[PDB]
């Protein structure tokens, strides 16, 4: 009954409302292929499942909380043409689910009810992977697909306003890696200790992610608005066996220490050559 193309940006909050995301999806989750059995819902790091909750909605009437697998690349958010949310039901499921479909994106509607304070426990969302040859070979689609295997659980809701104005809120989750192989080999950074410092550095930054090994090297880099790399420093990383999935790196010092404006830098992790994480965000501040 509403009209919000899945590709349109939406803030996570507006007015007194806020579309939180209590628990988060774990890092890895092997999507399943149509030619195979189901691989379950998206479990949480804890052992349970994700959880989203509204806030400013204090009226008493359920609301439909949408769910679709979104893209997770650099560019803005948009439906991931290679992955579809897949509805699981019955036995090991306590969330009634409705399954729509918009454009080419499958959407799973879950209800948020005042009974639980608008707090749904997403335990019925699965991930289906479509074959690439069938998605790339579509009259219009110019999206890649090869090595394109990370997603974001996108949530969306439409709180109706007594003024006759549909108020849309939306929020994505942290990226999940659906490839079996790109889970055993590619290192991933889930949480970073700090995100900046003066062009001095030296300060330690702890990284929390997966597949971090004794050879996990970190590298900072910089590039202009066109893509041409103009700086490549290999920040010093450490090794701690007691500490399971963390990494301690020493922020290298920016090239031009004589800067009057803050800058934008990126850093990743590399275990071999192909095994490389995504570019992480960081900023160097003036002395």
């Amino acid at each position: 009954a509403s009209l919000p193309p899945l590709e349109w940006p939406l803030s996570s909050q507006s007015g007194s409302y806020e579309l939180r995301i209590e628990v988060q999806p774990k890092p890895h989750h092997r999507a399943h292929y149509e030619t195979e059995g189901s691989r379950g819902a998206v479990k949480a790091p804890t052992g349970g499942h994700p959880v989203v909750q509204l806030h400013g909605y204090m009226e008493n009437k359920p609301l439909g909380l949408q769910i679709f697998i979104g893209t997770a690349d650099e560019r803005i958010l948009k439906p991931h043409a290679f992955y579809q949310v897949h509805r699981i039901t019955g036995k090991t499921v306590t969330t009634t689910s409705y399954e729509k479909i918009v454009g080419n994106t499958k959407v799973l509607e879950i209800p948020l009810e005042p009974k639980n304070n608008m707090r749904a426990t997403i335990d019925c969302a699965g991930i289906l992977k479509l074959r690439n040859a069938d998605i790339e070979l579509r009259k219009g689609e110019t999206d890649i697909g090869r090595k394109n295997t990370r997603v974001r659980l996108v949530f969306r809701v439409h709180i109706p306003e007594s003024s006759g104005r549909i108020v849309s809120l939306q929020t994505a989750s942290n990226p999940i890696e659906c490839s079996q192989r790109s889970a055993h080999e590619l290192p991933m950074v889930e949480r970073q200790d700090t995100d900046s410092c003066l062009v001095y550095g030296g300060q330690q930054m702890i990284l929390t992610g997966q597949n971090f090994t004794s050879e996990s090297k970190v590298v900072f880099t910089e590039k202009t608005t066109d893509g041409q790399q103009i700086w490549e420093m290999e920040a010093t990383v450490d090794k701690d066996k007691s500490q399971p999935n963390m990494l301690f790196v020493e922020i290298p010092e920016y090239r031009n220490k004589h800067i009057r404006t803050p800058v934008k830098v990126n850093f990743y992790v590399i275990n071999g050559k192909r095994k490389r994480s995504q570019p992480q965000h960081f900023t160097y501040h003036p002395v």
Binding site: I144, R146, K147, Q278
Partner: protein, 83 residues
């Protein structure tokens, strides 16, 4: 249904030097032949092979590795030699 009067190299060079950033991933070059000439909408096993071969053997076609895989590009001063 008509063998276009161009060499693979010439076309591989055209598809590239026509894309938004003058660089293309192999699959995209394929997508260019396919939607540009009806002759390429069949026998893919044969011409796709031909393209991969032209792309490696001629020095004017250089493979530039990146985060998202690898793209192909043309070096004009080179494509302007021996032809």
């Amino acid at each position: 249904i008509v063998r276009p009067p161009f060499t693979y190299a010439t076309l591989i060079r055209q598809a590239i030097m026509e894309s938004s950033d003058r660089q293309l991933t192999l699959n995209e070059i394929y997508s260019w032949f396919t939607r540009t000439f009806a002759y390429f909408r069949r026998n893919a096993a044969t011409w796709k092979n031909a393209v991969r071969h032209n792309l490696s053997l001629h020095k004017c076609f250089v493979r530039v590795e990146n985060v998202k895989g690898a793209v192909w590009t043309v070096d004009e001063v080179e494509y302007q030699k021996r032809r």
